[PDB]
Write a protein that binds this ligand. Sequence first.
Ligand code: CA
Ligand code: NA
Length: 259
Amino acid sequence: GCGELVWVGEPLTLRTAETITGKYGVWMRDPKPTYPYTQETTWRIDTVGTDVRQVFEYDLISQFMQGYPSKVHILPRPLESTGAVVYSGSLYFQGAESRTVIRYELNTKTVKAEKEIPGAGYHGQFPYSWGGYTDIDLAVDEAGLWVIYSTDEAKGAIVLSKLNPENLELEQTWETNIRKQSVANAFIICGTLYTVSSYTSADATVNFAYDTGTGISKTLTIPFKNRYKYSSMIDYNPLEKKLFAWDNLNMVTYDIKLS
Ligand SMILES: [Ca+2]
Ligand code: NA
């Protein structure tokens, strides 16, 4: 069931990158898996550098945690930053040095859709507080695919839009009052956007919420620990009902509780 976020557990480390290429990155699973993948399939992208194209795919959680990839994809266009997601068989990622979101179908290794996010800042205009060109952050929740960004019209406040996952059309858009560059990252649970206060602190918080169903903004004080002091990626997986994050070489997960 759905509800308001009221608690975040301790970070559990599932895998640690062994080279600087993985200081920051994104790892994820598909909340709507489709053949030939399952809910165990895991994708990992080490995102340090300027020509990021390698996506590590693991059929089994055991492989993700202890072994080599079962397949490596080479994306047809380099990828920007840590905001990508996998949803219903496709990797949704941002093209390097662009405001373009690309739908890359994993089974066929084929680009199925591309869309400029209208007005979105990119490449260091509205990053989260750590930088990293994190201007555009994709999200999956219980209702499907979203994108988190900002625009000049919004004066850098977080904007979020629901996306058509087939053709990337924007279906609805909400504007918050939260300065995107003032928070460490964000994610969406049950239609509510949440932000994290700090990417370095062991004593950070989930500090703001914006409910797209009611339009109401709130402050929160839910503890959030950056165990390794440099969180580059914090997303929510609605199938596992957990946070997935990347913290200074470490792929970590957090349990949650909803009201
Ligand atoms: Ca995020
Ligand atoms: Na994301």
